[PDB]
Write a protein that binds this ligand. Structure first.
Ligand SMILES: CC(C)(C)c1cc(NC(=O)Nc2ccc(-c3cn4c(n3)sc3cc(OCCN5CCOCC5)ccc34)cc2)no1
Ligand SMILES: CC(C)(C)c1cc(NC(=O)Nc2ccc(-c3cn4c(n3)sc3cc(OCCN5CCOCC5)ccc34)cc2)no1
Lengths: 274, 274
């Protein structure tokens, strides 16, 4: 743990709560001298030592990572004289899933294309840094000024007990509709697992925030539907090209899916034309 | 049949034979006053009235079609005082399949990308004109000056009795490895059937002319292999992007394949980058 991250907690001026869960929360705050004179920041904190580490493990993970434009970037932390705080960039428009739903500032197709592009840029970065995201969805992407989007993970700051998209499977509560077959049936999580999730995230964007596999519940039939190769139909705001791209992320063989460098090229092409 | 097509057969100066079959042939010739003062042309002709029409039906089909750059274009015809001739543009480098094989003028990846692009341009044209090609392969594409490629059909000017890629199935001899499942199992031939063939043609280009499904013979197992969703692995000269594109042409559902306008956009993007 580098010392340059350590930020005076007294310089933090707390505002409203941005998200809450059973383990922890994300507050909004004003931080003096971390950038102007002060900026808006988002602060992660807890509310049990089995999770005092899971935060600390997130702390060292975010510092090793390095910054990217399409990632919620760490600015500082408080880890010495009191409770642990992780200080992030503030994304004033909240998560992408709600942002899309509320937009049903006017929203164009090219914006949709941009959102998709930036997320693939951000996952390309993670691929390079050799990370996997175990919960990649639209709800785990934030929106800031200038239609910029940043990938994040609420993790302990989301109440999964009351989120219907997290389904009890085995000794856990998982976001099943976003998960790859190897994840579901072998507990495997790779960058290509993320690619499958990205495909679902594309569906989320170009449906404008419709729940994946709409009208289909998560029961015994769903797992056999996925396992027999079921794929969603085209979402309303998808072009023909995008749907094909979206479909490649859903190859049952994880080896047959595109990489994120591939996805960035495919979507870069679409942006240049659109 | 418009009269502007009618060309004086005396103005034709015949050279070598460019292709032969059981029904007819394609001669090379010099035609005076059909364009310079004279040009090289390719002439289709027969060698039985059940095929005197199949040629005449090709004649009226090529005149209704209109010209495109990536199509072997009709220039004139002789249909009044003697045997029927159809006068086409001359493509001096022969068919694309041999051209690739002999190149194993130096050949670059971007040329490969261009070949693929032009063929999709040409099939996009046919799609618009509401035609299907029932035999789309690399062997049915010609190469001219400037690395330009033009789609064609030898048809009666190819000896299928001695071409191992035409397999006896039912009461016919068909190019099985290039054929879509609906074609094979329902006798259906649509523009999306052509899309599947285009996928195989891509494989041909980026393998540099390797026979599709190499090491796999056309027997009972092959039809059940295709029917159970078997797809070729990546050809040696394919990039990651191209393979994904190539794979979309092979969706078992014909409705899930890209259109040719789609393919042109996908490959146009790749050209712009490469
Ligand atoms: C990606 C990677 C590296 C794997 C990772 C990240 C990670 N860790 C994290 O991503 N941590 C983290 C950091 C910040 C946030 C976060 C949430 N919000 C903001 N930052 S800014 C914000 C603003 C919000 O609402 C504003 C008002 N809106 C408009 C009006 O209506 C209400 C909504 C709501 C939530 C919200 C979440 C998680 N650990 O690993
Ligand atoms: C597409 C559509 C509309 C469905 C269609 C087309 C259609 N009908 C047709 O496409 N007809 C047609 C017209 C021309 C040719 C043809 C063949 N060749 C040429 N034109 S120019 C040429 C030159 C060749 O060799 C030159 C020397 N090479 C280099 C040295 O080694 C030897 C080889 C060989 C073949 C050849 C084929 C078919 N009917 O419908």
């Amino acid at each position: 743990y580098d010392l340059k991250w350590e930020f005076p907690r007294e310089n933090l001026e707390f505002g409203k709560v941005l998200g809450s869960g059973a383990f922890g929360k994300v507050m909004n705050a004003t931080a003096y001298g971390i950038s102007g004179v002060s900026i808006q920041v988002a602060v992660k904190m807890l509310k049990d030592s089995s999770e005092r580490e899971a935060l600390m493990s997130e702390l060292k993970m975010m510092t090793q990572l390095g910054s990217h434009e399409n990632i919620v970037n760490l600015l500082g932390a408080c880890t010495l004289s009191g409770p642990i705080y992780l200080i992030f960039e503030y994304c004033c428009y909240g998560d992408l899933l709600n942002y899309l739903r509320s937009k049903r500032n006017v929203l164009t197709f090219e914006d949709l294309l941009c959102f998709a592009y930036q997320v693939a840029k951000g996952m390309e970065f993670l691929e390079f840094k050799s990370c996997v995201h175990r919960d990649l969805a639209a709800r785990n992407v934030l929106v800031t000024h200038g239609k910029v989007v940043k990938i994040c993970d609420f993790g302990l700051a989301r109440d999964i007990m009351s989120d219907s998209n997290y389904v009890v499977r085995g000794n856990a509560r998982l976001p099943v509709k976003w998960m790859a077959p190897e994840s579901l049936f072998e507990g495997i999580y790779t960058i290509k697992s993320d690619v499958w999730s990205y495909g679902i995230l594309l569906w989320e964007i170009f449906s404008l925030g419709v729940n994946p596999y709409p009208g289909i519940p998560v029961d015994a039939n769903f797992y056999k539907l996925i396992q027999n190769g079921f794929k969603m139909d085209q979402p309303f705001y998808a072009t023909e090209e995008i749907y094909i791209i979206m479909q490649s992320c859903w190859a049952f063989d994880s080896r047959k899916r595109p990489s994120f460098p591939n996805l960035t090229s495919f979507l870069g092409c679409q942006l240049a034309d659109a």
